[PDB]
Design a protein. Structure first.
Ligand SMILES: *CC(=O)Nc1ccc(NC(=O)C*)cc1
Length: 133
């Protein structure tokens, strides 16, 4: 009988995630959330688990909750944008990826070419969507 802290469950979820045990990692992050539900990173951790499993509605809800808790979160806007892109909500996806870019610059955070690459892909898939449909 030990009940772990939220941070311990987060670390446990990280190890499960690296092992590609995403349902188990998601459940770990969920148990961290119940212990401290005001911590936005636990929600973006779980949202990435759901994205790996193509659970878009759950990933969307976690990203939106992370933004309620931290409206300036680069990660929440980025994974929200990715989720929306996979759901083909192209204009919302691009707008959230642009917000992630602007916030990362404001916050002095280096993500290499991650955000420009996501933006370029999102725009190209949007245009391809239209050039066909
Ligand atoms: C704890 C840890 O290493 N997590 C982690 C998160 C994300 C990724 N990369 C992708 O999902 C593409 C690797 C490891």
């Amino acid at each position: 009988g030990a009940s772990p802290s939220a941070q311990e469950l987060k670390e446990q979820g990280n190890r499960l995630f690296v092992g590609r045990k995403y349902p188990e990692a998601a459940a770990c992050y969920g148990r961290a959330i119940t212990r401290n539900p005001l911590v936005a990173v636990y929600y973006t951790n779980r949202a990435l688990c759901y994205l790996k499993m193509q659970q878009h509605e759950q990933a969307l809800a976690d990203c939106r909750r992370a933004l309620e808790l931290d409206g300036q979160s680069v990660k929440a806007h980025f994974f929200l944008g990715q989720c929306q892109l996979e759901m083909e909500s192209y204009d919302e996806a691009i707008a959230n990826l642009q917000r992630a870019y602007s916030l990362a610059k404001e916050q002095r955070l280096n993500f290499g070419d991650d955000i420009p690459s996501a933006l370029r892909i999102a725009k190209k898939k949007r245009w391809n969507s239209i050039e066909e449909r």
